[PDB]
């Protein structure tokens with residue numbers, strides 16, 4: 001699994017479950033092409049977005065739909081979504097875990113990159 | 116000042132100086148229209164982006180060029196940029212960002 | 228002002244006002260000696276803790292009473308307090324803390 | 340496993356490996372008694388600190404030795420250690436994951452509490 005995303009809720013001290021996210025890849029013409037999407041599980045994780053063959057070098061954007069998450073819980077948050085934009089696989093295949101920790105007016109995101 | 120941005124460096128324990136950013140406003144067709152831009156000062160702050168009359172309700176995106184900042188310090192970072200996307204709602208916005216090479220956080224303080 | 232503390236609330240998007248804190252200095256026997264204390268202002272800041280002459284090199288601990296802050300807002304938090312423990316080194320310190328009920332971050336900006 | 344700690348390095352985009360930590364429990368006389376200790380693995384995790392029987396209600400302090408970690412890498416960081424202080428098990432047994440994300444002048448910590 002070359003790209004995985006983990007999302008945590010800093011208000012409840014829990015995984016952020018059923019969080020939707022859309023991944024885009026920058027095309028040759030500089031537009032964002034849809035690449036993969038899904039929603040987090042009960043553990044706050046999203047696995048299986050892509051495969052090593054399909055996840056070629058490029059610039060990727062993970063848009064995590066945090067507003068929808070907080071609204072579904074009756075909280076009115078600040079951000080529309082959390083956006084994570086990065087070059088992937090530019091020195092060969094790597095495995096990426098993107099983590100995001102969510103509060104209504106703040107988030108943090110980190111990446112762990114392994115070879 | 117309706118909109119201010121402050122950027123800090125978590126590796127050096129310092130303001131993040133000369134960080135470029137662009138602000139965009141979402142247009143009716145869902146594209147991003149340039150709105151304002153600038154570079155942070157010696158105190159890590161960028162003031163004067165817009166005025167109360169111009170800063171109407173809408174979706175805005177602040178794109179902080181973190182990759183250039185880390186590159187000028189000779190450090191390889193993860194992200195291309197940091198993005199802060201939000202609705203401005205009439206019901207002062209300070210956007211803060213704390214940068215590390217493989218992580219960042221952002222918060223908003225909305226005050227009177 | 229050699230030492231300033233700023234505390235923000237990540238749930239409300241606001242300064243964290245009336246947050247109490249105590250500062251301690253590590254003594255030669257490894258106990259913590261009271262050094263300074265106060266409560267954050269309307270802007271989430273606590274100024275005036277110490278002076279340059281008193282703030283000598285040493286290990287200090289800032290204990291931020293986050294549990295009382297969340298309790299007064301009617302919210303159950305995780306931590307008893309946030310602790311920031313550091314060496315002051317002569318080779319201005321701003322300690323920031325961003326609070327959520329089950330998380331916090333802290334950073335130091337050390338400037339001239 | 341009722342108490343686990345995960346530590347990440349925000350400069351390298353990696354788990355924080357071989358990070359030492361000491362856990363204390365507040366005694367009846369208000370002193371901190373040593374409770375458990377260990378160091379993170381190659382995945383940045385520390386498992387097996389305690390058992391459900393021994394991990395009774397109380398106030399616990401996890402002191403993560405971040406300065407030693409950064410020094411061992413030739414970085415001079417700001418903090419002595421990261422301290423996580425919390426009441427545990429006060430409405431019955433729970434399982435706690437403490438996470439910490441480390442930079443030389445900043446850290447974040449979060450807790451996930453499950454039942």
Ligand SMILES: CC(C)=CCc1c(O)cc2oc3cc(O)c(O)c(CC=C(C)C)c3c(=O)c2c1O
Nearest residue numbers: 097099100101108109110112354382438440449
């Ligand atoms: C693939 C590997 C060795 C670690 C990747 C990884 C993980 O497998 C679990 C994780 O859980 C976490 C749980 C938390 O409560 C937490 O705060 C983090 C840190 C992420 C932040 C502060 C955005 C992480 C975190 O980054 C994290 C994380 O980076």
Ligand SMILES: CC(C)=CCc1c(O)cc2oc3cc(O)c(O)c(CC=C(C)C)c3c(=O)c2c1O
Nearest residue numbers: 130158211213222321323324325332333334336
């Ligand atoms: C002395 C100087 C050049 C900056 C010190 C300073 C400050 O004067 C105001 C600040 O407001 C902030 C407002 C925020 O919403 C915010 O998230 C931060 C970042 C600190 C964290 C995430 C613990 C800061 C922050 O670090 C900060 C900060 O470090």
Ligand SMILES: [Br-]
Nearest residue numbers: 021022063065
């Ligand atoms: Br979408």
Ligand SMILES: [Br-]
Nearest residue numbers: 040041042043
């Ligand atoms: Br599931």
Ligand SMILES: [Br-]
Nearest residue numbers: 080141174200
């Ligand atoms: Br949007």
Ligand SMILES: [Br-]
Nearest residue numbers: 026059085195
């Ligand atoms: Br891009």
Ligand SMILES: [Br-]
Nearest residue numbers: 213220221222
């Ligand atoms: Br921030």
Ligand SMILES: [Br-]
Nearest residue numbers: 209211224235
């Ligand atoms: Br602020």
Ligand SMILES: [Br-]
Nearest residue numbers: 307365398424
């Ligand atoms: Br305590």
Ligand SMILES: [Br-]
Nearest residue numbers: 360361402404
């Ligand atoms: Br120790």
Ligand SMILES: [Br-]
Nearest residue numbers: 379380381382
């Ligand atoms: Br191991």
Ligand SMILES: [Br-]
Nearest residue numbers: 253286312419
């Ligand atoms: Br110490």
Ligand SMILES: [Br-]
Nearest residue numbers: 440447448449
């Ligand atoms: Br964390």
Ligand SMILES: [Br-]
Nearest residue numbers: 008436438451
């Ligand atoms: Br977790």
